[PDB]
Design brief:
heterodimer, A: mainly alpha, Four Helix Bundle (Hemerythrin (Met), subunit A), about 90% helix, B: mainly alpha, Son of Sevenless (SoS) protein, Chain S, domain 2, globular, Breast cancer anti-estrogen resistance protein 1 (chain A), SH2 domain-containing protein 3C (chain B)
């Protein structure tokens, strides 16, 4: 019952998307007010934590799911999120190491920004699947 | 519909019944402490290890998992379940188990009032248990719960006991300081863990502690990425565990001793075992340090 699943986890994803949106919001303010690595690195951890909840969900869906189209989709998005989360850790490191560096911070910011985009598109594709199933 | 979300703890001390634990028991009843010490003493560290691993694995859903259990979980294995957001109750149960076990082991030790010399021998056996958990059983969960016991401030300040462990159980003491302790330090720093092929219960305490709420952004991502290997390997741990225990001849009473419900009731008594975990744990931290001071006074 792929549809049962997708709806269940889409709903799970959705409960945690609030906290992620908050973590990311907090991240962006710290960066905008020029906070030191002590601070924004902390916020990075929170952002990486919340978003990793989605990678796990995607992995489960990659395991259960009976439809092979649905396994291909969610494996892709889970893998792709983890890459972004690595990018976030790397560029965050670089931000701290070079602090204060407006440009190194921007790289870090762009990576978080793409993270928001991919988790969005991921939730969206979860929904589009579960709907293809009627 | 399909998969559900456990909202309540799967441990229910208040309803636990047995020959050891009668209806309305007091906390830390002496006879029962004595029986528990007797039960632990009766048997070598290896069978102690086999026993906890069994229970550990049942609670963690590495063993004893029906298809009907799987359907309710949405996943095959508890290892997978504890990465998922609804795995929350599992994660909390494993945390009660972990700390409550460490308390149990610590209390047996501080209950060894004969002399620093008997205590040292008991300490040496606790270490043997941790070495067995780690090596024979490949059970990182109770391995760390046992090391957790050996490292409570209340145990590590028993100077007479440690000195005499150094004198009489020299191999043991070294094993602890030079092998076990630094192994655990790696596991927790997300360094290379135990060979998957002997593993039966992987290191998941960093992970479940994270998801419930110290580390740096880099190990934090290290525990999380690693947890994917874990979840993907639920079927390997089950296998290993079932093969490692084929022919296991369990002693009922011993299983009781290593059961969290039994422990909660033992430690906190009926009534007491239902209090919050924070309060139960706060109050015991004081009970320990007092025993510890009566045993080997600081002055």
């Amino acid at each position: 019952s792929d549809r049962q699943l997708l709806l269940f986890y889409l709903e799970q994803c959705e409960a945690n998307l609030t906290t992620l949106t908050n973590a990311v919001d907090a991240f962006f303010t710290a960066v905008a007010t020029n906070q030191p690595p002590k601070i924004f690195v902390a916020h990075s951890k929170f952002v990486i934590l919340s978003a990793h909840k989605l990678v796990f969900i995607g992995d489960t869906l990659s395991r259960q799911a009976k439809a092979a189209d649905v396994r291909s989709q969610v494996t892709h998005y889970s893998n792709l999120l983890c890459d972004l989360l690595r990018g976030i850790v790397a560029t965050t490191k670089a931000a701290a190491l070079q602090y204060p560096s407006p440009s190194a911070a921007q790289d870090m910011v762009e990576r978080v920004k793409e993270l928001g985009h991919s988790t969005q598109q991921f939730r969206r594709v979860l929904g589009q699947l579960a709907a293809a199933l009627e | 519909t399909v998969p559900i979300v456990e909202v309540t703890s799967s441990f229910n001390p208040a309803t636990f019944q047995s020959l050891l634990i009668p209806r309305d028991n007091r906390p830390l009843e002496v006879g029962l402490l004595r029986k528990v010490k007797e039960l632990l003493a009766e048997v070598d560290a290896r069978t102690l290890a086999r026993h906890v691993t069994k229970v550990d694995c049942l609670v963690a859903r590495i063993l004893g998992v029906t298809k009907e259990m799987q359907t309710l979980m949405g996943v095959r294995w508890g290892m997978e379940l504890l990465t998922l957001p609804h795995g929350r109750q599992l994660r909390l149960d494993l945390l009660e188990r972990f700390h409550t076990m460490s308390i149990m082991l610590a209390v047996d030790i501080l209950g060894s009032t004969g002399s620093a010399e008997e205590r040292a021998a008991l300490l040496h056996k606790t270490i043997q248990l941790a070495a067995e958990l780690r090596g024979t059983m490949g059970n990182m969960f109770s391995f760390a719960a046992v090391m957790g016991a050996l490292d409570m401030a209340q145990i590590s300040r028993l100077e007479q006991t440690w000195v005499t462990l150094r004198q009489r159980h020299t191999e043991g003491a070294i094993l602890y300081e030079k092998k076990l302790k630094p192994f655990l330090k790696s596991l927790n720093e997300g360094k290379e863990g135990p060979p998957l092929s002997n593993t039966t219960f992987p290191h998941v305490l960093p992970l479940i502690t994270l998801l419930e709420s110290e580390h740096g952004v880099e190990v934090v991502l290290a525990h999380l990425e690693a947890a994917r290997t874990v979840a993907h390997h639920g079927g390997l741990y089950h296998t290993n565990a079932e093969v490692k225990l084929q022919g296991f001849q369990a002693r009922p009473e011993l299983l009781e001793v290593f059961s969290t419900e039994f422990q909660m009731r033992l430690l906190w008594g009926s009534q007491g075992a239902s209090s919050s975990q924070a309060r139960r744990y706060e109050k015991f931290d004081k009970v320990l340090t007092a025993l510890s001071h009566k045993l080997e006074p600081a002055v």
